[PDB]
Design a binder for this molecule. Sequence first.
Ligand SMILES: O=C(Nc1cccc(Oc2ccc(C(=O)O)c(C(=O)O)c2)c1)c1ccc(-c2ccccc2)cc1
Ligand SMILES: O=C(Nc1cccc(Oc2ccc(C(=O)O)c(C(=O)O)c2)c1)c1ccc(-c2ccccc2)cc1
Lengths: 200, 211
Amino acid sequence: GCRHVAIIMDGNGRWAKKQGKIRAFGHKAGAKSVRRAVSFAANNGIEALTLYAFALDSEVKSLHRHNVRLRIIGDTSFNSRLQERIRKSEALTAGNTGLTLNIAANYGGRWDIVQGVRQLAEKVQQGNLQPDQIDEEMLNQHVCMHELAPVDLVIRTGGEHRISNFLLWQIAYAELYFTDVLWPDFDEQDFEGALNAFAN
Amino acid sequence: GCRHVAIIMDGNGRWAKKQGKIRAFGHKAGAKSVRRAVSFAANNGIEALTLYAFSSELMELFVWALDSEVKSLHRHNVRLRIIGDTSRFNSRLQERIRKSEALTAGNTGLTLNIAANYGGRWDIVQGVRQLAEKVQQGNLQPDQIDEEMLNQHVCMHELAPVDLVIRTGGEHRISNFLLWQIAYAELYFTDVLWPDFDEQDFEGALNAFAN
Ligand SMILES: O=C(Nc1cccc(Oc2ccc(C(=O)O)c(C(=O)O)c2)c1)c1ccc(-c2ccccc2)cc1
Ligand SMILES: O=C(Nc1cccc(Oc2ccc(C(=O)O)c(C(=O)O)c2)c1)c1ccc(-c2ccccc2)cc1
């Protein structure tokens, strides 16, 4: 019963340079693998896919047309026009009922926790909330994706075995799956394999 | 070149099940493997070792270890720390904890951290609450609260960062152990059950980290 999958997409650059091709060539194949993995998730009743990449404006109409709700997690506070274009893609797809897609942009798991500290750190400095009252269930309501299904499964491609300051709070009970396959190569069968690991 | 290792010790019960023995046999065997992992770490230049048992489904009866192992660890120059929500506990064994720490705090060999009802989420909530008082006490502008700062209020802030997390026993989860602290740590999962995790398995992990 897997509902929320998070992916550290790695090996974009490696994959390209192995073929004697540039940094961007990998990111075009990487963008194609992203889509691949998005249909796969939508078609298998995954409710939430969170992608970490460690311009989108050309994917938006396509994602909208595929019933995908687009949300950006991270520190965007980015030049003012871009921030408004991000809001416009969010709003556009806000009514969609299919897969929820979260793209990490200048995101950090520690930053995420911080942000949430401060939402409470002035829910206090306006005598609204007691230190004593501060608990987990609370702080959780103030971290990214608290409205979404809890993260079940975290996938990292590219062969490294670390979280690298992707989700920290959210991954307390997630399954963690590391494959050497580089992101541009990661396909439906790679994805199913991770899903079966969860299932066992 | 790895300074701080944290270990989720799992597979004690499966280890005994395998031989048709009750859980308790595995626990006794796991106790031995802990001693073995503590020596290894002291004699292989590790500065800090952080140990988290893992149930899930008798755990308390880490009182046994506290009462039986402390004076030996002191003699071996091991600095003993208990991390976790201990406020929960009975007064008298809260004192035993406090007295074991006081005994060993000036030891300059291995720092040994023992997780007792620890949760990575609890750790963070605790760090925060400290700050949330520092706000309702003047002192601190919430403008000011950043990563460096909350870091200083989570467990083990005064030690080298966690470099390597080992989890034995087959499962691929943190299970709410360290969270904030494992941000950049290497994660190492082996199917060896804890009672069988020896020097050679620990060496494998350290050699894996080194690349
Ligand atoms: O608790 C410690 N080790 C330990 C070993 C074995 C089992 C175990 O708990 C389990 C695990 C699995 C199961 C199951 O069912 O799988 C069960 C069950 O359900 O009964 C119980 C815990 C420990 C205690 C104290 C120190 C220490 C303290 C102070 C100073 C120095 C060191 C270090 C480690
Ligand atoms: O770690 C435990 N004991 C222990 C004692 C003394 C030294 C020591 O490690 C060192 C450090 C430095 C040196 C050195 O400097 O050489 C040496 C060396 O000389 O080999 C050895 C380890 C322990 C912890 C928990 C349980 C337990 C768990 C659950 C239930 C019951 C018991 C059992 C044993």
